[PDB]
Design a protein around this motif. Sequence first.
Motif, PDB file in Angstrom:
ATOM      1  N   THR A  10      -0.887   9.575  -0.355  1.00  0.00           N
ATOM      2  CA  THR A  10      -0.884   8.694  -1.683  1.00  0.00           C
ATOM      3  C   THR A  10      -0.677   7.454  -0.867  1.00  0.00           C
ATOM      4  OG1 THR A  10       1.562   9.171  -2.280  1.00  0.00           O
ATOM      5  CG2 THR A  10      -0.019  10.635  -3.292  1.00  0.00           C
ATOM      6  N   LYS A  11      -1.466   6.353  -1.458  1.00  0.00           N
ATOM      7  CA  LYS A  11      -1.620   4.973  -1.281  1.00  0.00           C
ATOM      8  C   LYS A  11      -1.516   4.161  -2.233  1.00  0.00           C
ATOM      9  CE  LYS A  11      -1.884   1.612   2.044  1.00  0.00           C
ATOM     10  NZ  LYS A  11      -1.120   1.366   3.050  1.00  0.00           N
ATOM     11  N   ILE A  12      -0.537   3.224  -2.332  1.00  0.00           N
ATOM     12  CA  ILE A  12      -0.693   2.132  -3.294  1.00  0.00           C
ATOM     13  C   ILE A  12      -0.676   0.867  -2.607  1.00  0.00           C
ATOM     14  CG2 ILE A  12       1.980   1.894  -3.529  1.00  0.00           C
ATOM     15  CD1 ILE A  12      -0.709   2.001  -6.433  1.00  0.00           C
ATOM     16  N   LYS A  13      -1.140  -0.097  -3.181  1.00  0.00           N
ATOM     17  CA  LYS A  13      -1.314  -1.666  -2.563  1.00  0.00           C
ATOM     18  C   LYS A  13      -1.114  -2.510  -3.491  1.00  0.00           C
ATOM     19  CE  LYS A  13      -2.702  -4.245   0.751  1.00  0.00           C
ATOM     20  NZ  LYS A  13      -1.781  -4.127   2.239  1.00  0.00           N
ATOM     21  N   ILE A  14       0.276  -3.052  -3.528  1.00  0.00           N
ATOM     22  CA  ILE A  14       0.856  -3.717  -4.547  1.00  0.00           C
ATOM     23  C   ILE A  14       0.377  -5.347  -4.058  1.00  0.00           C
ATOM     24  CG2 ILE A  14       2.656  -4.439  -6.007  1.00  0.00           C
ATOM     25  CD1 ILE A  14       2.278  -1.819  -6.077  1.00  0.00           C
ATOM     26  N   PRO A  15      -0.311  -6.052  -4.836  1.00  0.00           N
ATOM     27  CA  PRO A  15      -1.069  -7.322  -4.366  1.00  0.00           C
ATOM     28  C   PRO A  15      -0.117  -8.322  -4.110  1.00  0.00           C
ATOM     29  CG  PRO A  15      -2.182  -6.478  -6.468  1.00  0.00           C
ATOM     30  CD  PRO A  15      -0.907  -5.603  -6.026  1.00  0.00           C
ATOM     31  N   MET A  16       1.338  -8.228  -4.387  1.00  0.00           N
ATOM     32  CA  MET A  16       2.381  -9.344  -4.152  1.00  0.00           C
ATOM     33  C   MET A  16       2.112 -10.776  -5.068  1.00  0.00           C
ATOM     34  SD  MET A  16       5.218  -9.830  -2.162  1.00  0.00           S
ATOM     35  CE  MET A  16       6.128 -11.293  -2.453  1.00  0.00           C
ATOM     36  N   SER A  17       0.936 -10.468  -5.874  1.00  0.00           N
ATOM     37  CA  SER A  17       0.840 -11.410  -6.702  1.00  0.00           C
ATOM     38  C   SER A  17       1.763 -11.326  -8.146  1.00  0.00           C
ATOM     39  CB  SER A  17      -0.480 -11.769  -7.162  1.00  0.00           C
ATOM     40  OG  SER A  17      -1.112 -10.772  -7.842  1.00  0.00           O
ATOM     41  N   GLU A  18       2.214 -10.038  -8.276  1.00  0.00           N
ATOM     42  CA  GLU A  18       2.757  -9.678  -9.647  1.00  0.00           C
ATOM     43  C   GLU A  18       4.358  -9.396  -9.415  1.00  0.00           C
ATOM     44  OE1 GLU A  18      -0.167  -8.553  -9.036  1.00  0.00           O
ATOM     45  OE2 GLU A  18      -1.352  -8.862 -10.977  1.00  0.00           O
ATOM     46  N   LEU A  19       4.939  -9.906  -7.981  1.00  0.00           N
ATOM     47  CA  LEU A  19       6.169  -9.593  -7.803  1.00  0.00           C
ATOM     48  C   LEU A  19       6.845 -10.793  -7.581  1.00  0.00           C
ATOM     49  CD1 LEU A  19       6.128  -6.335  -5.393  1.00  0.00           C
ATOM     50  CD2 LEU A  19       5.747  -6.603  -7.909  1.00  0.00           C
ATOM     51  N   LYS A  20       7.986 -11.057  -8.127  1.00  0.00           N
ATOM     52  CA  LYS A  20       8.881 -11.937  -7.891  1.00  0.00           C
ATOM     53  C   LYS A  20       9.369 -12.371  -6.578  1.00  0.00           C
ATOM     54  CE  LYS A  20       7.814 -12.980 -11.191  1.00  0.00           C
ATOM     55  NZ  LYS A  20       7.158 -13.725 -12.186  1.00  0.00           N
TER      56      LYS A  20
END
Lengths: 209, 412, 33, 96, 48, 395
Positions: free
Chosen positions: B324-334
Motif C-alpha cells: 500500500t502506497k500513499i503520497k501526501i503532497p505536503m501542501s496540506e500539512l502544517k
Amino acid sequence: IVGVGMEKLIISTNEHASTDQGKTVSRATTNSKSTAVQDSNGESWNTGLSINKGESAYINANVRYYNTGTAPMYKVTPTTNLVLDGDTLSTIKAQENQIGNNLSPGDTYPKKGLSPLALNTMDQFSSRLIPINYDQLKKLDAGKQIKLETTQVSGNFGTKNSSGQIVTEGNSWSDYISQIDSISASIILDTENESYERRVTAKNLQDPE
Amino acid sequence: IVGVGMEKLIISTNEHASTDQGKTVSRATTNSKSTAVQDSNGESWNTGLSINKGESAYINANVRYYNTGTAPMYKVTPTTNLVLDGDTLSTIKAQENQIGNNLSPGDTYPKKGLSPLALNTMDQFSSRLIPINYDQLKKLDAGKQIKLETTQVSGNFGTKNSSGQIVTEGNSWSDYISQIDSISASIILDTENESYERRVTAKNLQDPEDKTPELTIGEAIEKAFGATKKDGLLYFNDIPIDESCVELIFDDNTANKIKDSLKTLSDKKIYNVKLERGMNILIKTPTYFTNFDDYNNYPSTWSNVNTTNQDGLQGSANKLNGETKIKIPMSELKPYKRYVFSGYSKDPLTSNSIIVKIKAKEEKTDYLVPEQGYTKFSYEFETTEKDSSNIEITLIGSGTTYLDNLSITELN
Amino acid sequence: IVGVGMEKLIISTNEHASTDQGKTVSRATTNSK
Amino acid sequence: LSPLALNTMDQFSSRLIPINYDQLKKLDAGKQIKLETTQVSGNFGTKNSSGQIVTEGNSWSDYISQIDSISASIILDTENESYERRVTAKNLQDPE
Amino acid sequence: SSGQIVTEGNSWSDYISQIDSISASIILDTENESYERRVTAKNLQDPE
Amino acid sequence: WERKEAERIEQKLERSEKEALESYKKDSVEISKYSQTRNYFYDYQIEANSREKEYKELRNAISKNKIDKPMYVYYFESPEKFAFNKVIRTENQNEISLEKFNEFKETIQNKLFKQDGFKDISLYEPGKGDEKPTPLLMHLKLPRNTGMLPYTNTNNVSTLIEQGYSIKIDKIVRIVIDGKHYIKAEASVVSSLDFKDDVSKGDSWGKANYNDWSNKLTPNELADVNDYMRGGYTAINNYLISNGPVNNPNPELDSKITNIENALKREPIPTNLTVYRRSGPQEFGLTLTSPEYDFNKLENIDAFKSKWEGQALSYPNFISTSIGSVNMSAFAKRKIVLRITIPKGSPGAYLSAIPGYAGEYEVLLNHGSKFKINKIDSYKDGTITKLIVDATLIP
Ligand SMILES: [Ca+2]
C-alpha cells in the motif's frame, strides 16, 4: 442598532520648550613686580527642547452615535478601539462626558446640526488623557491614519406601568442581546439615504416543542 | 468555558531626551602701564538622555476572549498573568475598558472581524500603566517573549424576576464553579476548526443516597456533544467520533480507572466503561481517516484497493499481500506539527511482521507483530517546511494480513 | 484552612541615570596697540 | 492620655494644612493661633425594649434648634467643673 | 411615624419654585434686622 | 425609601412581637382566619386557645403605630365578601359582561359590610409584577388614627392592618389592566363602636353613659319600667307577638308598652354601636327539628342565604341584646347569632347600668323595629357549624 463614527482626530504633541538670555559685567586689576585694568562685559542666549518617549503626544477623536434599529436606547455608553497600523492603541469606554441620554431610531447624538463630541480621556473619572509613543507619532507624521472600531454598546430601555411612569434605570439591553440574536434572522435594507437593520424570529424545525 | 489569548505585545520605552543650543558675545579692554580690544564669539550644542531603572518601559497587550461551553457569560472579567522568564510581572483583573458585555457559546469578544482589545492599565480606575524594570527591558530587547496565562474569569448568568424581565446582577458563576467541578467528569472534543468542552454529572458509588443516573462513556459523550447514531456509531455532525475512528487522550488517573474497569468488562470497549467523577477525557479527530466503507478524505489514494472481503473492525479490510502506497503532497500539512499515523492490524494466522516505513523528515522503518485480534500501533512523524518534499508512507508486508481504520492525527 | 506560600521575590532598584555630551566653537580677535 | 493630632484638612486625611510666608513671619514674630469650635456632629442611642441600642442615623442636629428654641440655658460654674443645662420654659402668649 | 425628627432626604429645593410661584413677597427692613416673608395670593382667572 | 422606614419600626418592636410577625409571615392564612372568628366562643375557650397569644402580640404591634391623616389603600377582594355568590368572570376569562356588572351593582346598592380580620394591603396601585387573584379591586380610604405595620417580606415592603369597621361602596367602574377587565370600587369606612370580647370596656362605657339615665326618668315610670324588666317582660313580649292590640285590644298592657317605648325614647344611644344577640329558630320561622337547622351540610346554608340574605326583618316585640359577643350557657344551643349595628341617635338604653342583676350587659331596643340583612357567613363551633347574620337597624 447603535454604532459610532469618527469624523476627525486631533494630535497634541507634548513637548517642553525653554529660552534663556543673560548678561555679565566683570573687572580685573593686576599689580606685577606694573599695573593693569581690564573691563569686560558680554551676553548669551539659549534654547531647549525636551520630549518624552513614553508619552510623546495626546489624541482626541470627534465622534457621533447613530441608531438604525426599531427601539430607542437610553444612556448610550459605547466602547471603541483606536487602531493605528495593526496595533490597538487603547480601548475606551465612554465616560459620563460622552454619554447620550436619548437616541431614537433614525436619530444621531449629537443631533444633526451640532458638532461632534470629543473623546479625549481614558480613565474612569475623565482625568487622564490618551497618550501615544514616539514611534506611533512618527507613523502618524508619515501619513498613516487611525481607525475607530466599536466593539459593544451599553444602554437602557423603558418600562411603563399602568399610570404611564417610565423607568429606565436597571433595565439593560445587554441582558437580551444574546437571546434575541440566538433565535432570529437579520435583515438589512440599505437604500440610498438611510439604512435599516431588523431581527425577525425564525422557527426551529428540529424542536417539536 | 472562557479563556484569553494574546495577539501581540507593544513596548513603550520611557526615556527623556533634550537638546540645547546657544551663542555668546563678549568684549574686553586692557590698559597696561597700552591698550587692547578683544572681541569674542561662541556657540554650543547639547544632548541628553535620562532613564529610570524602576519604570523603564510600559507594556500593552492585545487580547481576545473565547467561549467553548454551553452557556453565555455576561460582564466577562478575566484575570491574567504576564510572565517573562519565570517572573510574573503583574496580574491584572479586567477593568471597565476590558469588560465584555456578551459572550455566546462559540463566539468571541471582540467579535470576529474586529481588532483585539488593548490591556494597558493595572489599577482599579484605569489610571496607571504597567511598568517593567531595566533588566526586564534588556531581556525583552534580547529576544525573549512575554506569555499570558488566564487564572480565573468572572461573569454573570440571567434569570427571571417576579415579572418576565431578565436579571443578571447578583447572579455569579463562581458560586457554582466548584460545585459543578466536584460532581462531574470533563469531556473535550477537539475537531479541527472549533473546540468543545463539557461537564457531565457522574454517580458516586460510595454514597447509597446518591440517586443520580448512571452513564457509560459512550452515553455521556452522546449526551454531551449531541452526537447521532447511524449504525451503532457516533457522528458529531459528519465526522465519526467512535472510539476506533479518533484518538483518545486521558490523564493518569483516568487511564488507571479505565484499565481496571476493562479487565472485568464483557465487551472490553472503552465506551462501555462506567463514567466516574474526576475523569479527564479528550477526543481528537484525525485530519485524514479511511475505514474502507464510506469515509475517505486523503488527498491521495491507496495503491491497494480491494474491499470485497467482509472482514475488519467494521465490515471492510482492504488489505492483501500487495503493498500500500500513499503520497501526501505536503501542501496540506502544517509546517511545524507533531503528526501521528495510526491504524489497526490483525493476523488471522501467525505469519511475518509488517515493514512500517515513514519518510516525512527522516526515513523511519519499524516492525509490528499483529495478534489474532486487532491492535493499534500509532507511529509518529513530523512535517518539515510546508514547501519541502512530499510525505511517503509505505506498509510493506506479506502473509495476507489485514488492516482497518487508518488515520493521520496531529497534536502539539 | 488556607495559607499562602511565596515562591520568589523580585527587586526593582529605583535609580535615575543620565548622560550628556556637548560641543563648542569660538573665535577671538585681539588688537593690541 | 496625650492630645490627638489635627494636621489634615481633606476628607481622606491626605493633605496637610498650609500657611503663607506672611503668616509664617507673623507666627515667628510671637503671634499666636487661636482655635474656635463652630459646631459638633454626633449621635444618640435609642434603646430597644430588649436592650438593643442603635446609634446609626440618630443625629443631634435634628434636635439642637428645637431644644434651643423652647428652653432657658443655665450654667453652674464650680471649681474645676462646669455644668450646662437646658430647662423648658412656658410661653404665655400661646393658650395651647 | 416612630415619632423622631428626620431631616435626611427632605430638600427645600423641591418647594422653592412652588412657593415662589403662588406667593407675594414682603420685606420689612427696620434698623437692626430684616424680615422676608411670602404670603399666598389668590388667582382670579381660575374659578377653582 | 421604605426599607429604612420599615427598619425604624421593627427596631422598636419586642422580641415576642418579632417572632409573632415571623409566624404570620410563615402561616398568614390560618392566623387571619382565626382572627376573623375568635370572639364568638366561650370566655374560657378563647383563653386556652393555642393561637390567642399570637393574636394579642400581632394586634399590639399593629396598634402601636397609627397614621395622622386619611390615606388610600389598594387591595384585591373576593366578590363574595360583599354577598355576591355568582362569578363576575372566571380566572381565565378576559372580559366582564354588562349583565354581571349590573347584577353586582344592584347587589351592593345600599348596604354596609363589616370586616373583622387581619389583611395584607398596599399603599400603591397594583402594577406589573403584582398578584391579581380576583376581578375586584378596592380603593378604600382609611380614617385617621388607624394602625398600619409596614414590614419587609423578601425585600417587598408589605403593610399589615387589622379591620374593625364596616365599609360601604360608593361607585364602581370597569377598567382594563394588561388586557383583562376588572371592577374597581371606591369605598369609604363607616366608623362604629364595637366591643368584641372585652366586656369590661363595654360595661364601663355603658355605665358612664347611662348611670345618670335613671335620674332623668320620672320615678313612677322608672319603677314601672324596672318592674317590667324584672318580672313582666316575657308576658309583654308574648302579648306583642300575638298582635294583641289588634286581635284582643286592652289598655292594661298597652299602657306598659307605651311606658316602655317612652322610657327608651327619653335618652337615645349617642354613638354608632354594635350589639350581639343569639336568635332562635322561631324567630326565622324554623323548628329545632327542622332539617335546615343543621348547618353542617352546604345546601342548608345556601338555601338559608338565598331566602334570607338581602331581605328585611320585623320584630313586633322588643329585642334583647348584649354588648359582648362571647358565648353563654344560657343560649348555648342557639346556632344563629345576630350582629346588629345601631346608628347614632336611635332609641335604646343600657339596662345593666342600673344596679342589681339587670341582665347580662343587656341593651333593649324599641319594639316594631325593622332590620336589613347585609351578609350571612358561617363559622365552625366544635362539632357543629353556627351561622352569623350581619344586619343594620333602620329608623
Ligand atoms: Ca472498516
